[PDB]
C-alpha cells in the first residue's frame, strides 16, 4: 500500500558565505562584531539533458570568537569579537532544486549522499582606517568534507521549501591567517572577514540517493509529485484506528500465534522491520517508551512498589479481596518473568501480528497502540497457585476455585491461606482456566502428566493439545485471541 521509489541524482551545490558587520562609534577605527550569517543563492545548471534550477542556503555553527582591541584610546585599532571557523565549527548547506525528486521528499525510507570535498580560502579585507598605514586581513583556509544528509526547510519569502541539508565538517588548512600590519600572525582558520575570496560561488559536486514512499492503493497506478504534505495530512481519529485494529483480528491464526508468542521479543526484534519513514525509524522505540511510562498499568506498577516501600516504615465478601489480589497478580505478571504461558505473551504476539501488517504514514501512532494494548488486552484473566495437589485459582473479576490436580473437582476456598502463598510461590497464568480444563478432563479424559502440564501452562502440552485439534483448547485459545480488542 506504500511503494518504495528510488530517486538518486547527481547534483552540483553552489553556495557562498554570508558576512555581517557592525561598526563601533568614535572616528572610525574600531569594530564591534564580524560574524558569519545565513546566505542564500540561486543558480541553474545542466544535468541529464535538462536545465535544473537550484536554490541553496549556507549557515555556520560552532564558530569561535577571537578578539583584538588596541585599548580604550579613541583611535587605536581593534575588533571587539571577530569570529573564525576551525575544527569544531560545522557548515550546513540546505539545497533545493526544481527537479521531480524534491517534490517527492515528504516521506523517505532512506537518504544518503556522496559529495566531494572542497577548499575554502579567505579573501583580503582592508579594514576602513581613515588615515595612515592600511591594515590587511588575509589568509586563512578550511576544507569542507561532507558528513551526513538530513531533511530541512528553507523559510523562503514566498513559501517554505522542503529541502535537503548537507552537514559538512571542517578542516583547517595551510595558509596561516594573519592580521598583517598588526599583532596577529600564524593563526590558522577561516575568519568571517571575506570567506568567499571574491569567488562567485563555492562549488561541491556529488550524488545523493533517496527512497520515497509515494502512496498507492493499486499496483498499476503510482503517483508523481507527492502532494499529501502535512497540511494535507491530519490526525487519524483515535476511535477510527481503534476500529481498524479491532477489525485486523479477522485474520489472526490459532497455532501460529502461539508459535510466535513462544519467542523472546525484545526492542530490536519487535520494532525492527516496520515499513516506516526515516523520521520515525529514528526514534520509534523511545517514542513508544515515553507513552508507555505514563500508562495506567505502568503507574500502577509504580504505585504498588511505592505503597510497599511506604508500608515498610508505616509500622460477596471474598470477591473484593480476590479481585484486589488479582490486580496485584496482573502487576506481578507484567514486572516479573513467569515460567508459564503468561497472558502478556499472547498479548504481545497479537500486538506484533497486528502492527507488522500496518504502515507509518507520517505519524508514529505506535504510541497509543502498543501502550494501549498493554493495558486493555485480555481484560479478565486468571491465575493459579498449586500446593499439595490442591491448586487454588483466582479470576481478576473476583471468582475463585480450589481443585485437585489428579482429579478436577473443586474444594472450599481458603482466603488468607491463598494470600500467604501468592506472595512467594510462583504464580501460574491460567490460560487453560478451570472451566475449560474441567470440560477437557470430562470429555477427553486426560492423564496425570498432561493434567499437571496444563495446570502449569506448559507450552509443550499446550501445543500438543492444539495440534491434536482438540476442540476445547482450540475454542478456548480462540476466545483468548478475541478479547485482544484494545
Amino acid at each position: 500500500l506504500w511503494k518504495e521509489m528510488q530517486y538518486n541524482r547527481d547534483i552540483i551545490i553552489r553556495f557562498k558565505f554570508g558576512n555581517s558587520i557592525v561598526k563601533m562609534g568614535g572616528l572610525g577605527y574600531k569594530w564591534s562584531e564580524i560574524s558569519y550569517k545565513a546566505a542564500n543563492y540561486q543558480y541553474n545548471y545542466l544535468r541529464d539533458g535538462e536545465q535544473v534550477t537550484a536554490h541553496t542556503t549556507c549557515s555556520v555553527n560552532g564558530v569561535n570568537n577571537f578578539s583584538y582591541n588596541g585599548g580604550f584610546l579613541p583611535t587605536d585599532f581593534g575588533i571587539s569579537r571577530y569570529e573564525v571557523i576551525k575544527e569544531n565549527s560545522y557548515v550546513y548547506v540546505d539545497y533545493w532544486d526544481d527537479s521531480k525528486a524534491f517534490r517527492n521528499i515528504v516521506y523517505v525510507r532512506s537518504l544518503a549522499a556522496n559529495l566531494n570535498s572542497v577548499r575554502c580560502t579567505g579573501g583580503s579585507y582592508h579594514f576602513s582606517l581613515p588615515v595612515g598605514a592600511w591594515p590587511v586581513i588575509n589568509g586563512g583556509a578550511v576544507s569542507l568534507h561532507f558528513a551526513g544528509v538530513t531533511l530541512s526547510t528553507q523559510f523562503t519569502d514566498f513559501v517554505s521549501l522542503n529541502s535537503l541539508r548537507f552537514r559538512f565538517s571542517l578542516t583547517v588548512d595551510e595558509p596561516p591567517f594573519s592580521i598583517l600590519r598588526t599583532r596577529t600572525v600564524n593563526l590558522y582558520g577561516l575568519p568571517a572577514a571575506n570567506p568567499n575570496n571574491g569567488n562567485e560561488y563555492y562549488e561541491i559536486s556529488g550524488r545523493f540517493s533517496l527512497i520515497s514512499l509515494v502512496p498507492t492503493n493499486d499496483d498499476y497506478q503510482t503517483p508523481i509529485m507527492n502532494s499529501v504534505t502535512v497540511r494535507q495530512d491530519l490526525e487519524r481519529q483515535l476511535t477510527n484506528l481503534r476500529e481498524e485494529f479491532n477489525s485486523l483480528s479477522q485474520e489472526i491464526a490459532m497455532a501460529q500465534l502461539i508459535d510466535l508468542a513462544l519467542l523472546p521479543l525484545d526492542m530490536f526484534s519487535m520494532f525492527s522491520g516496520i515499513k516506516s519513514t526515516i523520521d520515525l525509524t529514528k526514534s520509534m522505540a523511545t517514542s513508544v517508551m515515553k507513552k508507555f511510562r505514563k500508562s495506567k498499568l505502568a503507574t500502577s506498577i509504580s504505585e504498588m512498589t511505592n505503597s510497599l516501600s511506604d508500608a515498610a516504615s508505616s509500622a460477596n465478601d471474598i470477591s473484593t479481596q480476590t479481585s484486589t489480589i488479582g490486580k496485584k497478580l496482573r502487576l506481578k505478571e507484567m514486572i516479573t518473568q513467569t515460567e508459564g504461558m503468561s497472558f502478556d505473551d499472547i498479548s504481545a504476539a497479537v500486538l506484533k501480528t497486528k502492527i507488522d501488517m500496518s504502515t507509518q504514514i507520517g505519524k508514529n501512532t505506535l504510541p497509543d497502540i502498543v501502550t494501549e494494548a498493554s493495558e486493555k488486552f485480555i481484560p479478565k484473566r486468571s491465575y493459579r497457585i498449586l500446593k499439595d495437589d490442591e491448586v487454588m485459582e483466582i479470576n481478576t473479576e473476583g471468582k475463585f476455585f480450589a481443585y485437585k490436580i489428579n482429579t478436577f473437582d473443586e474444594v472450599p476456598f481458603d482466603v488468607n491461606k491463598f494470600a500467604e502463598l501468592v506472595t512467594d510461590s510462583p504464580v501460574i497464568s491460567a490460560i487453560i482456566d478451570f472451566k475449560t480444563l474441567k470440560n477437557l478432563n470430562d470429555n477427553y479424559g486426560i492423564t496425570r502428566t498432561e493434567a499437571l502440564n496444563l495446570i502449569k501452562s506448559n507450552p509443550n502440552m499446550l501445543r500438543n493439545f492444539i495440534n491434536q485439534n482438540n476442540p476445547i483448547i482450540r475454542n478456548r485459545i480462540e476466545q483468548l485471541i478475541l478479547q485482544c480488542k484494545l
Partner: peptide, 25 residues
Amino acid sequence: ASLIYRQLLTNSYSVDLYDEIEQIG
C-alpha cells in the same frame, strides 16, 4: 514474547535524556 513489556519498562529511563535532546535542541 512478554519480554518486550519488561524491556520497555526497564529501558524507559532513556526517555528522560531523549526529551532532554528535544528541549535542548
